[PDB]
Amino acid sequence: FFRRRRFCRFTAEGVKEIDYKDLNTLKAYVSETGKIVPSRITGTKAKYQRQLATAIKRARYLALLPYTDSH
Amino acid sequence: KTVVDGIAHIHASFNNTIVTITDRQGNALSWATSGGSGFRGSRKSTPFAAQVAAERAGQAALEYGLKNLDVNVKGPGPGRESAVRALNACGYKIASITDVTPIPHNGCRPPKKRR
Amino acid sequence: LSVEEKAQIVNEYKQAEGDTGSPEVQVALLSANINKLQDHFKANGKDHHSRRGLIRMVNQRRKLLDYLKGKDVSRYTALIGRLGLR
Amino acid sequence: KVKEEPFDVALRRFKRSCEKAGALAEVRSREFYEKPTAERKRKAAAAVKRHAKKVQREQRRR
Amino acid sequence: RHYEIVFLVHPDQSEQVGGMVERYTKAIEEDGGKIHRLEDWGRRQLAYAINNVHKAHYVLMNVECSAKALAELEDNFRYNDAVIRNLVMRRDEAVTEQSEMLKAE
RNA sequence: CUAGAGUACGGUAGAGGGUGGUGGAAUUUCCUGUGUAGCGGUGAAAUGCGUAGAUAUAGGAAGGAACACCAGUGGCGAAGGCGACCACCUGGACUGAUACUGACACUGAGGUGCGAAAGCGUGGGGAGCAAACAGGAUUAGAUACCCUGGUAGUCCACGCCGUAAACGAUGUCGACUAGCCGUUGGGAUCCUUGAGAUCUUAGUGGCGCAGCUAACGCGAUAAGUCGACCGCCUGGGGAGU
């Protein structure tokens, strides 16, 4: 039920407009290499999974998160 | 000439395997290939021949010392992990093992499909 | 079209009603919106998917006029001349 | 990336960490270009093999 | 309206950045745009190399200006060597202060 | 007169368009260091590339196009189509409350538009890929498959052409007819902690009863029961000539 509670990581709270600033949240959703996790592993609702993917791609642009283990 | 804590580069295609011992500066010390060990064909692509060429690079590296190695594995082909087990057989302290793999995000388009 | 630009028109061509349903309200709102877009389509020439929306509003405007002519004539020419159409 | 302690442990921590990350099946699909219709066959046949697997397992779940 | 301009400067210009704040925001006040936050996150290490540096100095700023002051800071960041990246945003809302540097410490 | 249809008001979701800008990984060409005998390719080889210092390996520069992971029977668009991030203009759909107009509707011969890709015209631009072509191999023979090279083209601006297995092989619109399991988005009611509950619309999938069907099979997204208008069929070749 670990994939069930992470659906409530955004829906149980009123944190609907997520930001690209809380890196302590976003590092839970990024794998060890750098690529972004699926949504059948976290089990988050697909409204927020689309909203989660934008905050990664903006934080990646501002060099707050890497791409690969190369750089 | 004396250098220590070198870096081992391993390049593994579908038909050949090239092993090179370098420094942190990226300078050649000893290179050894699967074709130079005398296989040349269907025997060339085997993971056994990636052990013969691996230790032979590990014998001209003791000219300069190099008691510590840092391994970068690169390539899709077989013998990708068999070459690492043929490194400390010569008696080398392997510190860490690291995948380096060229993966284009979109990249140029590859050649066409065989028939 | 903005919100207060809608409210400027409903105040003007009201039929002493306070009501937005009559054809003299509906024809006026469309005609002010066609004239706004004509400089969007002089910069953007190859905007075809938005060209398709403008022809919906033009054909909607010639249907409300014939409903208006199909009822009265006095209300018709007092609206054609006040906007300059046909 | 795998650091180091015997050596056989760090091998199996590396053979598995590469596969659990990926970048080995993706390399194998870079050697012939698929036209986007043939990439719509993977999208078609794999969706059938997942929705039929949710129902054939229910026969085992009887 | 209601922009969220975020831009980072060179690590060697982080001393001079205090005058760089008001030099930009005074021209916004000429337009008629109030500023609702101005945060300075400080000197941090990047995730990768941007023109072969590794430190930066992040400047968070939220501006509510009209279409002319947006045309100002769009051009001034391009005509600088201190600023090395920027990002103009848009939200359709207002701005409260003190987001995360309390929590980032 | 307000049940069709349309307007005004909140509110969400989206690879829906157009105009600029900016990224990171990878490929190639070039420069420079180290270093020295092969690399590359294949059922196996050969053509090719190499000490006139290649592959490898490190540093640097230039340039071109595509946009991993998220990504899904998932979305949007009238259809073709549409996936990097931001600004910029810009179309329509959903959902709720409420007032107004009071049948203002449907379909559409002719006519008007938007039309994948290959191709054509003038100008740009040239990373990879690659018809035509060249060489090697296989082969009684091999123009072919396989291998090493390689040009128009693919890319951009402007204009043209109008066809495709342009496919759901199913014209658009409206009304009734047992169920169950999914899923996108949106309100509800509800004990409240929910991994909640049930109901209702707008989509999109898997089974299924009546019913229809030559059979296969469809089955509230009908090929079921019925209406309104349009297009089209009449043995095979000859011939969409």
Side-chain angles (χ1 to χ4, degrees), chain A residues 1-5 8 10-12 14 18-71, chain B residues 1-105 107-111 114-115, chain C, chain D, chain E residues 1-91 94-105:
Chain A
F1 64 97
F2 180 76
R3 81 277 293 150
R4 293 177 177 93
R5 48 87 53 218
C8 296
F10 297 101
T11 64
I18 63 171
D19 287 330
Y20 57 92
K21 297 180 175 66
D22 193 0
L23 272 74
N24 201 2
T25 299
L26 294 175
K27 288 183 183 293
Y29 291 100
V30 177
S31 67
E32 65 180 1
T33 304
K35 61 180 73 175
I36 185 169
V37 300
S39 69
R40 65 183 177 272
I41 305 301
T42 65
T44 60
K45 297 294 189 291
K47 178 178 178 179
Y48 291 97
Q49 179 68 40
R50 292 195 297 270
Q51 192 174 3
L52 198 278
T54 304
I56 299 297
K57 295 184 179 69
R58 291 173 180 170
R60 280 178 179 173
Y61 176 76
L62 274 71
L64 296 174
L65 296 173
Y67 292 167
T68 323
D69 56 356
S70 178
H71 57 81
Chain B
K1 188 181 290 184
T2 302
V3 291
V4 293
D5 191 73
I7 295 167
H9 290 284
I10 296 167
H11 182 73
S13 298
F14 288 95
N15 290 315
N16 195 358
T17 302
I18 299 171
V19 177
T20 302
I21 302 299
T22 57
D23 55 355
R24 276 90 65 196
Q25 300 304 110
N27 292 320
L29 291 172
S30 176
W31 62 273
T33 63
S34 299
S37 299
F39 291 97
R40 300 296 298 166
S42 177
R43 300 172 64 249
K44 182 182 177 182
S45 301
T46 63
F48 173 71
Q51 286 190 358
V52 177
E55 54 87 19
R56 189 176 66 185
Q59 292 175 357
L62 292 172
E63 181 184 1
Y64 305 101
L66 294 174
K67 304 298 184 291
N68 301 114
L69 270 70
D70 297 327
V71 175
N72 291 322
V73 184
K74 183 175 182 179
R80 178 174 170 85
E81 73 273 15
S82 175
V84 181
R85 288 186 287 111
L87 289 175
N88 55 0
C90 294
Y92 290 159
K93 179 180 177 181
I94 297 168
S96 296
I97 307 166
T98 302
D99 282 324
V100 283
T101 301
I103 295 301
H105 287 75
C108 294
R109 56 179 290 169
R114 295 169 57 87
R115 290 190 296 273
Chain C
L1 189 63
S2 297
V3 177
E4 288 83 5
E5 296 295 325
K6 291 179 183 178
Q8 189 66 43
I9 298 169
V10 177
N11 291 316
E12 182 178 358
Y13 289 165
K14 187 184 289 186
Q15 294 289 107
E17 294 175 353
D19 298 325
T20 69
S22 64
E24 289 85 6
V25 177
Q26 294 176 356
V27 173
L29 292 176
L30 298 175
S31 295
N33 202 2
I34 299 170
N35 292 316
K36 179 173 70 69
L37 289 173
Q38 290 292 320
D39 288 331
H40 183 274
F41 290 97
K42 291 296 184 290
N44 289 316
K46 274 77 177 175
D47 195 0
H48 288 290
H49 292 88
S50 300
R51 188 76 57 85
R52 185 62 57 191
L54 190 145
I55 311 170
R56 179 171 177 176
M57 292 179 284
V58 174
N59 293 317
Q60 191 66 43
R61 193 181 70 187
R62 289 191 296 113
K63 290 183 180 180
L64 297 177
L65 293 176
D66 289 334
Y67 172 67
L68 187 64
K69 185 184 285 187
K71 290 292 190 288
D72 294 328
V73 182
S74 67
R75 295 178 66 185
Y76 181 73
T77 59
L79 184 62
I80 302 301
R82 197 172 65 184
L83 297 180
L85 297 179
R86 297 293 299 159
Chain D
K1 290 182 180 179
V2 170
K3 294 182 181 180
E4 292 186 356
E5 285 289 327
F7 187 73
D8 200 3
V9 172
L11 292 167
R12 294 178 64 188
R13 287 181 63 249
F14 176 70
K15 296 179 185 179
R16 183 69 69 190
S17 65
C18 182
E19 182 68 28
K20 285 181 174 176
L24 184 61
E26 188 177 3
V27 185
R28 196 173 298 115
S29 68
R30 295 282 83 81
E31 306 175 5
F32 65 100
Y33 179 74
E34 284 191 355
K35 300 181 182 183
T37 67
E39 290 180 353
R40 260 85 60 85
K41 288 184 183 179
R42 295 173 183 172
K43 295 182 181 180
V48 176
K49 288 184 179 181
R50 291 187 291 114
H51 196 278
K53 195 70 177 294
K54 290 171 69 174
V55 183
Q56 289 182 358
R57 286 179 65 88
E58 295 294 325
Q59 302 296 318
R60 184 66 177 86
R61 296 292 293 166
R62 291 178 68 251
Chain E
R1 305 297 302 272
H2 297 270
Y3 301 98
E4 286 195 346
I5 300 167
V6 179
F7 68 100
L8 56 149
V9 302
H10 199 273
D12 296 331
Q13 301 301 107
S14 179
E15 299 87 2
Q16 301 176 357
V17 77
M20 297 178 70
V21 174
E22 182 60 30
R23 188 178 66 193
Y24 290 158
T25 61
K26 185 180 262 77
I28 301 169
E29 292 292 327
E30 185 179 2
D31 185 74
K34 52 186 176 293
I35 295 97
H36 293 274
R37 73 169 70 187
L38 284 168
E39 292 188 355
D40 298 333
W41 292 358
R43 184 182 297 273
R44 292 195 291 169
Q45 188 178 4
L46 306 177
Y48 57 95
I50 301 170
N51 296 113
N52 301 114
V53 306
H54 294 84
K55 297 295 188 293
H57 185 75
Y58 290 158
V59 177
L60 180 64
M61 177 176 68
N62 294 335
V63 180
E64 297 180 357
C65 66
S66 69
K68 177 59 69 178
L70 184 62
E72 298 174 354
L73 292 176
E74 188 72 28
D75 184 74
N76 287 317
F77 289 156
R78 298 182 65 86
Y79 290 161
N80 281 316
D81 297 332
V83 177
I84 198 163
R85 294 277 182 85
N86 53 354
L87 178 64
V88 58
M89 293 298 297
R90 172 193 277 268
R91 295 186 184 177
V95 165
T96 66
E97 293 177 351
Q98 287 183 356
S99 67
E100 289 182 359
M101 297 308 293
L102 302 173
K103 298 179 181 179
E105 290 180 353

